[PDB]
Ligand binder design. Structure first.
Ligand code: CL
Ligand code: CL
Ligand code: CL
Ligand code: CL
Length: 289
């Protein structure tokens, strides 16, 4: 059963892309963000829970050192895999939780990760000791338990977060170039940075849709619909966010699953389920195509 990454995790994406690039694993940014989600939900200082991989006490690293170490550690597990003749990504993902010894274990037993191999490795390392594990995946599989070592369901947990139209894709491919950028009032291009309506105008403009300059003018130019009927690529509008002369004071890009991408300070994803965003929500608007 597939799931969506939280805004708390997604805020770490520019930093994750930086260190993934430095370790030659830019194609695995999605896996690295799924690991953060599973490990800390993006709210712990050590976001990747990579302190133990550096032989340090739990939660010793700061956020930057955590992403640096997590990326470096995951890159070493992929290298260890390649060197032992393993092509399977799931071996590197399970070894993030189990340690590099799971690579060697799998290399001599078929070169592929299987739930049965993950289960046998944990059974050996635990000394045949069980512990309660009430995650619905474990409940449905064996009643709700695991062998007392690492997490034998780790691959499946990470792959829950690794499961939109053409307009949404073009708008977001442009918008994500400015993730973590400082909000600039009156900004409508990459040379000045952007404000909320400046970001939507530029990115939709790159997708071939001509939008007016203001959040209010953008609201007036769209077909309105409630957020419950909205899709990724629709705009989401807000009232009274600051002292302004118009009804609409803020605009964002709806990205589905009750979340948006906006400017935003820094520019990025926001969870719409917070009390604040619910109290300012007008609804959504569909652009003319
Ligand atoms: Cl046993
Ligand atoms: Cl037991
Ligand atoms: Cl803002
Ligand atoms: Cl329009």
């Amino acid at each position: 059963t597939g799931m969506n990454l939280s805004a708390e995790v997604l805020k770490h994406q520019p930093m994750v892309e930086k260190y993934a690039r430095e370790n030659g694993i830019s194609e695995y940014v999605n896996v690295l963000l799924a690991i953060i989600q599973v490990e800390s939900g993006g709210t712990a200082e050590d976001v990747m829970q990579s302190s133990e991989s550096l032989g340090l006490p739990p939660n010793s690293l700061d956020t930057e050192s955590s992403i640096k170490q997590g990326c470096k550690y995951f890159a070493s597990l992929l290298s260890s895999s390649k060197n032992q003749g393993i092509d399977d990504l799931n071996v590197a993902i399970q070894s993030y939780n189990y340690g590099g010894g799971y690579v060697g274990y799998v290399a001599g037993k078929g070169k592929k990760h299987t739930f049965n191999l993950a289960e046998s490795f944990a059974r050996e390392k635990s000394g045949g000791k069980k512990v309660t594990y009430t995650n619905p995946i474990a409940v449905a599989k064996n009643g709700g338990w695991r062998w007392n070592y690492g997490n034998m369901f780790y691959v499946e947990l990470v792959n829950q977060y690794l499961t939109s139209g053409e307009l949404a894709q073009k708008v977001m491919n442009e918008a994500l170039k400015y993730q973590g950028w400082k909000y600039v009032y009156g900004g409508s291009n990459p040379n000045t940075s952007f404000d909320c309506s400046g970001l939507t105008q530029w990115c939709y403009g790159k997708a071939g849709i001509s939008l007016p300059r203001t959040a209010q003018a953008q609201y007036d130019a769209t077909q309105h619909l409630p957020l419950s009927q909205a899709k990724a690529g629709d705009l989401v509008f807000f009232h009274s966010t600051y002292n302004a002369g118009s009804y609409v004071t803020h605009v964002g890009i709806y990205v589905g699953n009750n979340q948006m991408y906006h400017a935003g300070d820094p520019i990025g994803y926001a969870d719409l389920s917070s009390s604040y965003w619910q109290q300012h929500l007008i609804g959504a608007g569909r652009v003319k195509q």
